[PDB]
Amino acid sequence: RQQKELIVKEMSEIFKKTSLILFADFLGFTVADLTELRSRLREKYGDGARFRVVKNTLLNLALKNAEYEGYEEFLKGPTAVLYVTEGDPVEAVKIIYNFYKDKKADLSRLKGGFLEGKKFTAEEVENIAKLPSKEELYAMLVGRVKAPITGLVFALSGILRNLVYVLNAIKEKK
């Protein structure tokens, strides 16, 4: 059909800049289901993330050309692909995760993929869905680094706060 080369070249260049690639078994899901998942994804990513159905053969060639390795396992049988080209990469995983849950689907259907290059398995999907966004991770990092200073201030002002605390407790008793 040769239009394949168009998609393989198209797909290949996409996989070179993705921050997320996740393989999902969407077999059995309906047309309405597809539209719905894509709608949830756009609500957060605009054009930045996609959920597409592509023949394993072409998908395999695109991944291959992208220089990825050990993905063959995720391609056993018709497989759809979820990927992010712009924005937080973790949110897309949380979206499809709770979507499968909303659909009472076997979460093992989320086979695995690559998170910013790092391969992850079906089991780790749940761990990724529990990760805070990258933006929140940065906020958390700032707090972790600052903890000694914050701990110092609170430890010191706590001596006076404990006074106010017990005093209100005495008042409370009456």
């Binding site: 200073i149 110092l152 201030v153 010191l156 002002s157 001596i159 006076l160």
Partner: peptide, 30 residues
């Protein structure tokens, strides 16, 4: 001043000095 010396110095501060120390620390170390 060692860590333990710092603590001993803090213990000898008056309550009003403690309140100011806390206020000052919040600034210098934001």
């Amino acid at each position: 001043m060692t860590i333990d010396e710092i603590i001993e110095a803090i213990e000898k501060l008056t309550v009003s000095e403690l309140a100011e120390l806390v206020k000052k620390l919040e600034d210098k170390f934001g």
